[PDB]
Structures are given as structure tokens and as C-alpha cells.
């Protein structure tokens, strides 16, 4: 099970989630179960936390192949969070048993995808480039921002979300 697109809308008003189940033959029995949204405040390592930001159960929408693909567009202001200074964690679940021929390690019910707003980062890069235009010297804040973004990338791809939030809160919010 995987993500098709997991993006925040360019208008900074919707959080786009478009999930799908993998096309391989032995997820025929497997479906999509729920969508749980967490922020940098309510995250826990062991799956979604209690009192989450927004829970979604997918039988509610439909009345079986329609249930294998889902698309959500959440008005972020309705979630009562800041679209610019929020890092969303999007969990998904399966509620379904694959066949007995699955190769090992592929049978995992849950996934996760981190989300942030790239507009503030784009504005910071534009500001630093404007500074570079004057006298052709590289500000050190620009290199610091680049390397800290790469640090958060490494933390996310290695799954070390606690230190990822620590860096986010320490550098890209305050």
C-alpha cells in the first residue's frame, strides 16, 4: 500500500491525500481502512496517538474496488491548525489479510507520510538569493538552512521523527 500524491495545496488551503493499494495480485483481499492525521504536537512512535487531529473511516464515504482507492481534501482551517507552521503525519491502515504467497516483509498494514508547507522555504530561498545578488557573497544562514533541511530529510527517511521535530521546532518555526 502506497501514496499517489501527498501534498499541501498551492493555495495553502487544502491538504491533499490520495492513497492507493498496490496493484500486485495478492492484495486483492486487502482494502483501505482509515486515515489518521497527527501533527508535531500529538505524534507518538507506536502508531497514531490518542486524541488525534482528524480520524477518517472509509466505509462512511462509499455505499469493493472503489474502497481500494481514496482521495481526501481537508480544509486546513477547519482542522484549526496553521498551514505554514504545521508538520502533518498521515497514517493509513488496511483491514485485510494478504494471500499466503506474499514475499516476506511486504505484508505491512500501516504506512506513514510526512507533510510540510514548501512556500515558506521557497520565500526564504528567494530572500537569500536576493541577498546573494548584492555583492555576490553567500550568506551563512542560507547554507545553514540548506543543511538543516537536509538533516530533516535524513531524519524522515530514516524514521527518526523525534529529532526531526526537534530540528523543525528549533529552526523552521522559532
Amino acid at each position: 500500500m502506497h501514496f499517489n500524491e501527498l501534498r499541501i495545496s498551492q493555495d495553502n488551503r487544502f491538504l491533499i491525500i490520495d492513497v492507493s493499494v498496490d496493484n500486485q495480485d495478492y492484495f486483492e483481499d486487502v482494502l483501505l481502512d482509515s486515515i489518521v492525521i497527527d501533527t508535531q504536537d500529538t505524534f507518538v512512535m507506536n502508531g497514531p496517538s490518542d486524541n488525534p487531529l482528524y480520524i477518517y473511516n472509509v466505509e462512511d464515504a462509499y455505499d469493493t474496488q472503489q474502497m481500494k482507492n481514496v482521495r481526501l481534501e481537508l480544509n486546513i482551517q477547519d482542522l484549526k491548525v496553521s498551514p505554514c507552521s504545521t508538520m502533518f503525519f498521515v497514517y493509513v491502515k488496511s483491514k485485510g489479510t494478504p494471500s499466503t504467497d506474499t514475499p516476506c516483509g511486504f505484508d505491512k498494514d500501516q504506512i506513514l507520510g510526512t507533510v510540510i508547507n514548501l512556500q515558506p522555504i521557497y520565500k526564504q530561498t528567494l530572500k537569500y538569493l536576493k541577498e546573494v545578488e548584492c555583492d555576490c557573497n553567500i550568506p551563512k544562514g542560507f547554507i545553514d538552512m540548506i543543511l538543516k533541511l537536509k538533516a530533516i530529510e535524513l531524519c524522515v527517511r530514516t524514521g527518526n521523527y523525534p529529532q526531526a521535530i526537534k530540528y523543525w521546532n528549533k529552526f523552521f518555526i522559532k
Binding site: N46, G47, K95
Partner: peptide, 19 residues
Amino acid sequence: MFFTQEDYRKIEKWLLANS
């Protein structure tokens, strides 16, 4: 945690296992 139903069924299955 966010337990799914099937996990609960597993829990009661293994609890009534020592029935």
C-alpha cells in the same frame, strides 16, 4: 496506538485461548 478491530479479535481469541 490506534487499535484496529481485528487486533481486538486477536486479543479475545488469545484470552479465550485459556478458556
